[PDB]
């Protein structure tokens, strides 16, 4: 075998991450082998101690990888032999590297998803709490990055929490299909020794066992969807990244990141660069990249097993480490950023109540198109008089429409503006509180696993 | 008001597919506007009566679009106004285009999804049913596209059916997040007229209402999911298309497609090209593209609404039609293709039973490594004698290991070979049957 | 054939766009069939008269399509027969639809790329000229979207002209490989009747001819790189859009779009939505998708021809009309946007000059590290006295380092600040003026590359 | 300061690959720094002495790292400070880490592209040379993965060589845009000390210098272009891998890969698994992933520098190494693979010559349709008499058309079949020879300018 080939085929570098799960998978298989009558009670005991010792070497970071080790599987097989003798060879009876690969990677994914869940929920929890505490703060709502209408700083935070919560539900859905045992599938036709797959299921703690050996070996649906969900979740973070970065400029001045999540120079001690947020926005590309790569690897592949499939491991490991890092950095930013209630308050302008003034007429029976026009004049009449809209005269307004009354003054209040949105999901205070309740009930259920 | 700029906004060319759903949403909103007092019982009467005729117009293909109509929403907005007068204007009270866009698309998707589902369950049923009938057939199981071990053709068909079964599951899931009402979100802060969203929910038949107005106007998670599940579905089909394409070459000769799904020529009557399978294989790329575009569109956009979001429509609509066509074509190919039991069988060689020769010794007590060596020495010994290992003499095998008894003959039998895989999920007959039962029960939980 | 399968093959809707180039290809081939002996001069004349007739029917827009037409190559094949009958059949002698497809597509791309370049050079021109006019405007330069060292507005404008100019170079390069004649490759083994390929080349005006029939028929490199370069170009525009969109926010107040390329309402008539720029940003995704699809279509496909290759047509045309419209709208926006020198100036602040203050000590000999510390103490003490750095005293300054002189008073001036960058590529006026000459030249050469 | 945050910056793990080039970028800025006046001739010698030492510690594996060094630059600076003292600091005068990263990346790409280019040409030479030697082998060419008509093995090999040739040309175009110096751009406004950029260019050996500092700092075109080109190249390989994998099946039995590039078991000695081709085909996705990723990263970014740009380094290094191995593995696969002339020949059938039998009539003046129809009858007749068309009798064929003459017996010969395609690009032997010479010529050109 050519050197440049075996190097390109090598995977020991990164798949060492599967060392622990590889062992657990062999332990279970050994146990079931004993039940099948392939191993004796004695041999099994020799294989477990051996395997467990190998487990310790890795955990202690003392395992010795050698030149020959093509992958983590061979590595672990070599060690067991060195440690217990040719007896270790009986372990591979009926087994196939083909099924180890998917078994280990799924085991690794289950464990990984457990951690990603934790951090993902902590991020959501962090956004919801902040929304609860700052429920009074109001600032501009944007469209086309232009000021549209007032909204509660909380409605903004909750819109992100809501999106991230759908991400938590999707992750949960992926987890169920990853939680299905492929071991006992052989090279492609099944285990040839009537292995007790049910027993294998509960040793590894999988929810159920794979239905078809050919599919179980050649499918990488779990990788694709984990990657797809990972990507959409990063898309949500990239969106939030964009928001905070813009809000964190000096032009906007709505908030300032904490020292731990920013960079700056002594020459401009007040300037803070949102490195953390930019780092996170970029990971969306990194993750999408991995998703696209695997979608391309699977397309057109004949059945059953093909070497092309080996590309999954690295992609899955990178994305796992990417999410873990990114979620935690996100939690921190949101937790420690400093808002300027004063600046957000100043961003609220009279111009932004032209919409509200139109609605005021609508409530008094005036038709949509006419009220709109009416407010249109008030806004124009204000330009002429060279004054802000809230300082026009009741006498001025009345020249526009008889329907304006002393009670029109309330329109020019921002709290009144937001409180207009009581309908479920709106930005009114009750609606913000309703959302914080809904999201907490949601997280209690999603975590009840 | 710039000529080319206008060209880019025009969507009316493709979004007329939302004509009926747009009308239904306006109908639901009007009703709620009456309940809020924005419209009088009378006004409502006249608004629906109009909306209804706009619907009937579209359904009957009679609706007539004008050069000024820049998109389906504007078209119905203009048609209603010229059918009932200035009164039409009150219909837009407190309502935002930002919310019509998502409401209509979610309705369109919900509907298309039922249709997709029916076509998908049909494909699955065709594979399962065929696996049931051709269960006795046996052919090579491949790895690296080299003959690995003997498998049942049914196991091959069910592996694909199982994969599509997961596709059906994901679809249902996407469906639940799509079946949520976004109406009453305003342009971003919500409905300013305390609209009854529960009423709108019931009228339109959604399962629940969107939780946050900002999130509801700006997210296209529902699109990305649909495109992702769709791409994976197509990936599965691109895999099946490849197997059948290779299996239908004259070299392999396992099957032949019907004339309905193949092309040929008069100079070579027996030659059949599987372009139905080729079209299908290529659509995996098409669908993948739409997925990549929307992702790219969403990345980095700030809250809340941004013109960029308008790209979703065309992508969703294409993928929906592509899926509907591809599935039906898939089903036909599967049920009318003709397999050659003879050729699939002549393809099984004794060289594939060397693995079985070793298991034989393993079942007789020998540990794996030595069994593999023994089987290997027998394989080698045969090359030496220039014959097939199934033609070795018992004396020849005992020459390699006393463990070999006269019964070893039972090894060189392809039925006995596949019948070793009884463990759940294997290719053994009992196990294939079990898969068929399990799949029938899933198809049933799927319909529900 | 199955009904749904027929819908899957129907490409007539979008491929009519190749009607003209298809007819040009037939004419070429036809004439080459005469020279080959397969046709008589008489026959050629009767076929050309028919083809020419069809051409007009498309150009006049009066061609009637039948529900029988699955694709453009069929519509013409039939229509020619309706016109001249049986003699039309000889035109397809030795020809393969597999070669009609790429030939027609390469012709359409050539014609198209010629249109696209026109618009691209025009966009680049716009930026460059406007750059010269507004060469005096100065505003903040950003990194991390936070203010760094001030720069000239023109420098900004030119950064986009330069990137766009590389896009133009890449298109020129794609144009070359596209401009290779595939006609005469047959189904996959080449033309069997020894047709004069070079003659077809001349007639069709291709630079050269394809080297391998199998490669010619099965490759789609020309589609891939075309979508590739377009995608990069859109990336550049998506970046420029992000810039202008943000610069157009009332929060920044640096510029405003004309009404022709914006949106707004009567309630807030003083506000403008950057619709144009947002559409364009979104189109980067659209184009990228088309790129992704063809890449997936082609991966792992076997030699030589497969129906899969049919997915190229639509993608190409879509990307062509997107580029064509996006560039035009992009030129309009840049052309009509109104800036605010008043605000771009204000955004310029004293804190942005601490760097210059430190450089100042470098010019006077002090090493970088020590000078960095020096400037540090300076902006720090300016804080203590609660005053802007520019107002410290020569003594306050002298207390930090004896090296401070009274000339440091020039340090607190923006124009001087930008004028520090005289090295090629920098924002200094002469460096900017130089770039404007270079761009004009590059555009000259590219313009004269067609 | 946050720990997780710091693991996301630690690029040392992979950017060490810029160690040597980073040092060269500095050795060049120092020398330029001296000319500017910032350094003394004695200082320069001192600084260069350090760098020139640091360069060795890496090129010998001794450069000890530190869990304080986030990136390769910080690592290289640290070791310079330790080697020469506070004088090192001056090396950073006016220099911005923003320009160091682009400078280092392009230099690393210029070097890598040159190595890659060598392997690419080796692959191409391996296919063109083998095509010459095995130019007589004839096998069926496929469309829709079905048999269409005889072709020369060499016509197949050359088609892949031709596609790879265009990759070679694209890579060459990309190298010219990467060979442009961005050093001297500062943080975004340019170098503030009038550094001599021409001196830098010459020292580092670039062809020209960047035109605009803002662009030079923020553009990642060179990463995108390289990724695009590398993806098309891999697609080409994914297609070659598919053909060879399929041709290596026992079903086709056309060729066999060597053990060095295959896998198998003692249980089935003859079975050989094309792992080499499979690994290669899969990389098409991996490399494409990198391209998708960077395109998303740049899309929508505002000017100028943004931390996001930091995702370029790893993608580039990964594709460089992926391209390097894949190309060598391919060359080894083609060169050491064994073909089966016998089986390639047994695959050629008479049914495949009906087409030729039709062209036989055409060349004698019969119109296509009539000739095609006529060939159809010969085929049906053969079914009738239950024999192959080469067995039909002259009297038999006459009964179909009086145009058939005894010389028609020469239609039924496979060498004769391929020989019909003499038109430039076709599968005839003279064409295959012209192609080989044309390719040998191209490689020459593309090799000289590399």
**Using H for helix, E for strand and C for coil, what is the string for chain A?**
CCHHHHHHCCCHHHHHHHHHHHHHHHHHHHHHHHHHCCCCHHHHHHHHHHHHHHHHHHHCCCCCCCCCCCCHHHHHHHHHHHHHCHHHHHHHCCCCHHHHHHHHHHHHHHHHHHHHHHHHHHHHHHHHHHHHHCCCCEEEEEECCEEEEEEEHHHHHHHHHHHHHHHHHHHHHHHHHHCEECCCCCCCCCCCCCCCHHHHHHHHCCCEECCCHHHHHHCCHHHHHHHHHHHHHHHHHHHHHHHHHHHCCCCCCCEECCHHHCECCCCCCCCCECHHHHHHHHHHHHHHHHHHHHHHHHCCCCCCECHHHHHHHHHHHHHHHHHHHHHHHHHHHHHHCEECHHHHHHHCCHHHHHHHHHHHHHHCCCCHHHHHHHHHHHHHHHHHCCCCHHHCCHHHHHHHCCCCCHHHHHHCCHHHHHCCCCCCCCCCHHHHHHHHHHHHHHHHHHHCC
- Residue numbers in B near D358 (CB within 8 A): 267
Alpha-carbon gap, residue B279 to D144, rounded angstroms: 11
Q: Are the beta carbons of D112 and D222 closer than 8 angstroms?
A: no
Q: Do D89 and C424 touch (CB under 8 A)?
A: no
Angstrom distances, CA of residue D108 to CA of C172, C424, D103, D111: 27, 24, 9, 5
Q: Judge: A282–D325 Cβ closer than 8 Å, yes or no.
A: no
Q: How far apart are CA A246 and CA A161, in angstroms?
A: 19
The tokens of D175 are what?
A: 């190298």
* Contact residues for C266 (Cβ-Cβ < 8 A; gap 6+): A372, A373, A375, A376, A379
Site of tokens 């072709």: D151
Residues of C in contact with D90 (CB under 8 A): 367-369
Yes or no, beta carbons of D147 and B250 under 8 Å apart = yes
Only one residue has tokens 């020794």, namely A193
**Strands D180-181 and D208-209, how do they pair?**
parallel
Q: Which residues pair with C142 in a beta bridge?
A: C147
**For residue C143, what is the enclosing H or E element?**
strand C142-143
**A262 is written with which tokens?**
């920013």
CATH top-level class for C11-107+179-218? Answer: mainly alpha
Residue B140 bridge partners (DSSP): B150
What are the angstrom distances between the C-alpha of A293 and each of A101, A300, B327, D314? 19, 14, 25, 15
Q: Which residue in B141, B47, B50, B126 sits closest to B90, CA to CA?
A: B47
Backbone angles phi, psi at A152, to 5 degrees: -85, 135
Smallest Cα–Cα separation from D192: which of C432, C417, C156?
C417
| Contact between A308 and D281 (Cβ < 8 Å) | yes
Q: Which two tokens stand for residue A193?
A: 């020794």
Q: Which residues of B241-251 are buried (b: 16+ CB within 10 A; e: fewer)?
A: bbbbbbbbbbb
Chains contacting chain A through 3 or more C-beta pairs under 8 A? B, C, D
C-alpha–C-alpha distance, residues D239 and D330, integer Å: 12
| Chains contacting chain B through 3 or more C-beta pairs under 8 A | A, C, D
Which residues of B are catalytic, by number?
Answer: 144, 265
Using beta carbons and an 8 Å cutoff, which residues of D are at the interface with A? Answer: 1-2, 4-5, 7-9, 259-261, 273, 275-276, 278-279, 281-286, 288-297, 306-311, 315, 325-326, 328-329, 332
Backbone angles phi, psi at B339, to 5 degrees: -95, 155
Interface test with B, best of D146, D257, D376 (most B CBs within 10 A): D146
Nearest CA in chain B to D346: B251
Per-domain boundaries in chain C: 11-107+179-218, 108-178+219-348+421-447, 349-420
For residue B222, give how far its alpha carbon lies from the nearest alpha carbon of chain C (Å): 17
Backbone φ and ψ of A168, nearest 5°: -70, -30
Q: Are C202 and C234 in contact (CB under 8 A)?
A: no
Q: What is the CATH number of domain A349-420?
A: 1.10.40.30
Decide: D177 and D222 in contact? Cβ < 8 Å: yes
CB proximity list for B42: less than 8 A, separation 6 or greater:
none
Beta strands in D200-306 (DSSP E): 208-209, 255-256
- A390 neighbors A413 (Cβ within 8 angstroms): no
Out of B146, B266, B301, name the one closest to residue D250 (CB).
Answer: B146
The token pair that represents B142 in the structure block: 């491949």
Say if residues D295 and C231 touch (Cβ distance below 8 Å): yes
Question: Out of D144, D250, D266, D406, which one is annotated catalytic?
Answer: D144
Closest-CA distance, C414 to chain D, in angstroms, reads: 13
Tokens 């089909």 -> residue? B237
User: For every residue of chain B, which 3-state class applies, written as one string?
Assistant: CCHHHHHHHCCCCCHHHHHHHHHHHHHHHHHHHHHHCCCCHHHHHHHHHHHHHHHHHHHCCCCCCCCCCCCHHHHHHHHHHHHHCHHHHHHHCCCCHHHHHHHHHHHHHHHHHHHHHHHHHHHHHHHHHHHHHCCCCEEEEEECCEEEEEEEHHHHHHHHHHHHHHHHHHHHHHHHHHCEECCCCCCCCCCCCCCCHHHHHHHHCCCEECCCHHHHHHCCHHHHHHHHHHHHHHHHHHHHHHHHHHHCCCCCCCEECCHHHCECCCCCCCCCECHHHHHHHHHHHHHHHHHHHHHHHHCCCCCCECHHHHHHHHHHHHHHHHHHHHHHHHHHHHHHCEECHHHHHHCCCHHHHHHHHHHHHHHCCCCHHHHHHHHHHHHHHHHHCCCCHHHCCHHHHHCCCCCCCHHHHHHCCHHHHHCCCCCCCCCCHHHHHHHHHHHHHHHHHHHC
Residues B218, B224, B228, CA angle at the centre, nearest 5°? 175
Q: Tell which of D224, D248, D249, D306 to mutate to test the B interface (max B CBs under 10 Å).
A: D249
Tokens of A160: 């992100």
Beta bridge partners of D138: D152
Strands A138-143 and A146-152, how do they pair? antiparallel
For the question of residue D144 being annotated catalytic, the response is: yes
Q: Compute CA distances D365 → B22, C39, D354, D405, D422, whole Å.
A: 64, 10, 17, 13, 20
Q: Distance from D61 to chain C by nearest Cα, in Å?
A: 30
State how far the Cα of D300 lies from the Cα of A149, in Å rounded to an integer: 25
| Nearest residue to A206 via CA among A174, A180, A185, A176 | A180
Tell me which chain A residue has its CA closest to the CA of residue D3: A260
> What is residue C192's three-state secondary structure?
coil
Two structure tokens written together for C45: 């004349």
- C-alpha to C-alpha distance for D200 and B38, rounded to whole angstroms: 73
Q: Which of C144, C271, C376 sits opposite A267 (nearest CB)?
A: C376
Task: State the helix-helix crossing angle for C153-178 and D153-178, rounded to 10 degrees.
Answer: 160
Which among D70, D268, D297 is the top mutation candidate for probing chain A, defined by the most A β-carbons within 10 Å of its own β-carbon? D297
With CA atoms as reference, the chain C residue closest to A249 would be: C146
Question: CA of D151, closest CA in chain B: separation in Å?
Answer: 17
**Helix, coil or strand: residue D304:** coil
Distances (CA, A) of D224 to D84, D206, D294, D306, D312: 39, 20, 7, 17, 9
Q: Which other chains touch chain C, taking contact as 3+ CB pairs less than 8 Å apart?
A: A, B, D
Backbone torsions φ then ψ of D92, nearest 5 degrees: -95, 5
Instruction: Identify the residue among D153, D277, D289, D302 best suited for mutation to test binding to C, counting C beta carbons within 10 A and taking the highest.
Output: D302
> Nearest CB to C144: which of A144, A273, A299?
A273
State whether D159 and C93 contact (CB < 8 Å).
Answer: no
The candidate with the shortest Cα–Cα distance to B298, out of B284, B285, B312, B317, is B312
CB neighbours of C47 closer than 8 A, spacing ≥ 6?
C30, C39, C80, C84, C87, C88, C90, C91
**What are the φ and ψ backbone dihedral angles of B146, each rounded to 5 degrees?**
-115, 145
Give helix C97-133 / helix C19-35 axis angle, nearest 10°.
130
Question: What is the Cα–Cα distance from B440 to B444, expressed in whole angstroms?
Answer: 6
Set of chain D residues whose Cβ sits within 8 Å of the Cβ of C153: none
Gap from B157 CA to chain A (nearest CA, Å): 10
**Cα D128 from Cα D131, distance rounded (Å):** 5
Counting every residue written for chain D, the total comes to: 450
Distance from CA of A138 to the nearest CA of B (A): 12
**B55: left (phi > 0), else alpha (psi -120 to 50), else beta?**
alpha
Is A238 in contact with B187 (Cβ distance < 8 A)?
A: no
Secondary structure letter of residue C283 according to DSSP: H
φ, ψ for residue D18, nearest 5 deg: -100, 5
Distances (CA, A) of B411 to A192, B214, B347, B389, C341: 13, 68, 17, 11, 90
Give the bridge partners for A143, in sequence order.
A146, B305
Residue C209: strand pairing partners: C181
Query: Tokens 């639509």 label which residue?
Result: C314
d(CA D381, CA B343): 27
Q: Identify the burial level of C406 via C-beta atoms within 10 angstroms of its C-beta, where 0-12 means exposed, 13-18 middle and 19 or more buried.
A: exposed
Q: Point out the residue among B261, B283, B290 whose CB comes nearest to the CB of C2.
A: B261
Q: Which residues of A are catalytic?
A: 144, 265
d(CA D164, CA D121): 9
CATH architecture, domain C108-178+219-348+421-447: Up-down Bundle (1.20)
Choose among C276, C281, C293: nearest Cβ to B285.
Answer: C293
Token pair in block for residue D224: 């995108």
From A91, which residue of chain B is nearest by alpha-carbon distance? B368
Q: End-to-end distance of chain D based on CA atoms, in angstroms?
A: 46
- Nearest residue, CB atoms, D307 vs list A279, A291, A332: A279
End-to-end CA distance of chain C: 46
Query: Is the distance from CB of C427 to CB of C151 less than 8 angstroms?
Result: yes
Q: Say whether A315 and D290 touch across the interface (CB within 8 A).
A: no
Cross-strand partners of D142: D147
Task: Say whether D227 sits in a helix, a strand or coil.
Answer: helix
Question: Among residues B107, B222, B103, which one has the least CA distance to residue B171?
Answer: B222
Cα–Cα distance for residue pair B253/B343, rounded to 1 Å: 6
Size of interface C-D (CB pairs under 8 A): 314
What is the rounded distance in angstroms from the CA atom of residue D213 to the CA atom of residue C423?
10
The answer to whether C390 and D162 have CB atoms below 8 angstroms apart is no
Question: What is the chain A residue with the closest CA to C244?
Answer: A145
C-alpha distances in Å from residue D291, one per residue of C20, D282, D294: 36, 15, 5
For residue C75, give both structure tokens: 């519509």
Burial classification of residue C433, based on how many CB atoms lie within 10 Å of its CB (0-12 exposed, 13-18 middle, 19 or more buried): middle
- Tokens 């039939």 found at: C78
Chain C residues within 8 A of B292 when measuring between CB atoms: 285, 288-289, 292-293
């Amino acid at each position: 075998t050519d050197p440049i080939m075996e190097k390109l085929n090598s995977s020991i570098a990164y798949d060492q991450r599967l060392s622990e799960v590889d062992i657990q998978a062999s332990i279970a298989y050994a146990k079931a082998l004993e039940k099948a009558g392939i191993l004796t009670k004695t041999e099994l005991e020799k294989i477990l101690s051996g395997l467990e010792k190998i487990s310790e070497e890795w955990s202690k970071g003392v395992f010795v990888v050698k030149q020959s080790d093509e992958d983590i599987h061979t590595a672990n097989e070599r060690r067991l032999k060195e440690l217990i003798g040719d007896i270790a060879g009986k372990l591979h009876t009926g087994r196939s590297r083909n099924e180890q690969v998917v078994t280990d990677l799924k085991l690794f994914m289950k464990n990984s998803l457990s951690i990603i869940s934790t951090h993902l929920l902590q991020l959501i929890k962090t956004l919801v709490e902040r929304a609860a505490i700052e429920i009074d703060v109001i600032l501009p709502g944007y469209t086309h990055l232009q000021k549209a209408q007032p909204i509660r700083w909380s409605q903004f935070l909750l819109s992100h929490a809501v999106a991230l919560t759908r991400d938590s539900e999707r992750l949960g859905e992926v987890k169920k299909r990853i939680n299905v045992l492929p071991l006992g599938s052989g090279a492609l036709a099944g285990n040839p020794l009537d292995i007790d797959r049910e027993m294998l299921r509960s040793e590894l703690e999988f929810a159920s066992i794979s239905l078809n050996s050919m599919d179980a070996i050649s499918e990488r649906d779990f990788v694709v969807e984990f990657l797809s969900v990972a990507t959409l979740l990063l898309i949500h973070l990239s969106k939030m990244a964009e928001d905070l970065i813009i809000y964190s400029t000096s032009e906007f001045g709505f908030l300032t990141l904490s020292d731990a999540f920013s960079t700056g120079s002594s020459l401009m001690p007040q300037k803070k660069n949102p490195d953390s947020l930019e780092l996170i926005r970029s990971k969306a590309g990194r993750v999408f990249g991995r998703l696209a790569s695997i979608l391309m690897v699977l397309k057109g592949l004949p059945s059953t097993y093909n070497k092309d499939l080996q590309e999954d491991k690295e992609a899955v490991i990178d994305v796992v480490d990417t999410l873990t890092a990114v979620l935690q950095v996100a939690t921190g930013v949101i937790s420690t950023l400093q808002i300027s209630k004063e600046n957000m308050e100043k961003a609220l302008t009279p111009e932004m109540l032209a919409t509200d003034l139109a609605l005021y007429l609508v409530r008094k029976g005036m038709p949509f198109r006419q009220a709109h026009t009416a407010s249109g004049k008030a806004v124009h009449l204000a330009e002429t008089k060279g004054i802000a809209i809230n300082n026009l005269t009741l006498e001025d307004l009345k020249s526009i429409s008889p329907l304006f009354s002393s009670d029109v003054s309330q329109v020019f209040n921002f709290v009144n503006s937001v409180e207009q949105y009581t309908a479920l999901g709106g930005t009114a205070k009750s609606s913000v509180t309703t959302q914080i309740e809904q999201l907490r009930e949601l997280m209690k259920k999603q975590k009840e696993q």
